[model samples]
Target: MLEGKVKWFNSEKGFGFIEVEGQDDVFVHFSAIQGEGFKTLEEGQAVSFEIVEGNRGPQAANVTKE
Candidate 1:
């Protein structure tokens, strides 16, 4: 798992970017969030996630707010 802070989240679009500890900002989509009730995520929230290769770039998988 990689630790990071949510840099930005587009609630209307259901996507966001996370600034990883030692890496570039990672792309995160709502589908990658585990479980239910996660309507939307907020910026500056700390989180951990698994990195997976996406079609266009790296995507966050199994992300959880910490």
Candidate 2:
């Protein structure tokens, strides 16, 4: 898993980005979060996640608070 900070998220739109460790920002969707508190993502919220090669770029999954 990659460690990162949530750059931002749009709950209504269900998408976001994470500033990954030693990597470029990755795409994230609300549905990929692993637990509760799926309401929103705050900037600088520490998190860890697995990476998958999405059609457009790297996407984050199984995200967990760190």
Candidate 3:
């Protein structure tokens, strides 16, 4: 898993971007979030996730926010 900070998030849209520790921003879909009650993610939150190749580009999978 890679550690990063939430660069931006749109709660209503359920999507966001994470700035990885050593890489560029990665797109994250709400569907990729893990655990229960994940619909309350906020911007600037710290998170960890796996990097996977999505149809558009690099996306974050199995994301967990703290």
Candidate 4:
């Protein structure tokens, strides 16, 4: 899994960006998070996920707070 920090998240939109050092921010959608309740990331929060080829390019999968 790749480690990164939350750049920002819009709960209303249910999507955000994850800041990976030396790499472009990875797009994260609420569905990517592994949880049952509300899935939202806070700025600067640590997280880990795998990169997958999304329709828009690189995106995060199986994301979880670390």
Candidate 5:
């Protein structure tokens, strides 16, 4: 898994990006998070996820707060 900060999220859009050190921000969709009813993400909050080859390029999956 890779670790990074929240970077930015759009509650209305249900998607965001993570700033992985030495790498480009990884795209994250709300579906990838284990929200359990809580879907909002904060900037600077620590998170971890695996990198996957998305349609365009690298993205985040199975994301969870750390």
Candidate 6:
């Protein structure tokens, strides 16, 4: 799994970006999070996920908090 830190997330907007070391930030959507309840991410939280080609660019999938 690819490791990164949550750059920012907007629960109201339901989207965010993950900052990967030495690479561009990856987009994350609430639907990609792996958990129960209202899925969302916090700033600076460490996480792991897979990168997939999104409609815009790189997007995170199967995200898990660490």
Best by lDDT: 6
What lDDT tens digits, residue by residue, belong to model 2 across residues 2-65? 7999988876898889897677898888877877865567778898999887577678888887
State each model's C-alpha RMSD to the native.
1.4, 1.8, 1.5, 1.1, 1.4, 1.3
lDDT of 4 by residue, 18-61 (tens): 99999999999988998778888888989999989947788899
Please give the clash total of every predicted structure, in order.
0, 0, 0, 0, 0, 0
* CA-lDDT, candidates in order: 0.86, 0.82, 0.84, 0.91, 0.84, 0.92
lDDT of 6 by residue, 2-52 (tens): 999999999888899999989999999999999788898899999999998
Better structure of 1 and 4 per lDDT = 4
Q: Residue 28, candidate 1: how far off, in angstroms?
A: 0.3
Give candidate 3 misplaced runs (Cα > 4 Å).
none
Candidate 1 lDDT by residue in tens digits, 1-66 = 888989999989899998986788888998877757955679998888988994787899988888
Question: Against the hidden reference, what TM-scores do the models get?
Answer: 0.87, 0.81, 0.85, 0.90, 0.85, 0.90
Give the Å error, residue 32, model 4.
0.3
lDDT tens readout by residue for model 5, 1-66: 888989999978888898988988988888888658867677787998888894788778889888
Clashing residue pairs, candidate 5? none
For candidate 5, give the lDDT of residue 35: 57
Residue 24's C-alpha lDDT in candidate 3? 89
Winner on TM-score between 4 and 5 is 4
Error of 2 at 26 (Å): 0.4
User: How many angstroms is residue 64 displaced in model 1 relative to the true structure, after the best TM-score fit?
Assistant: 0.3
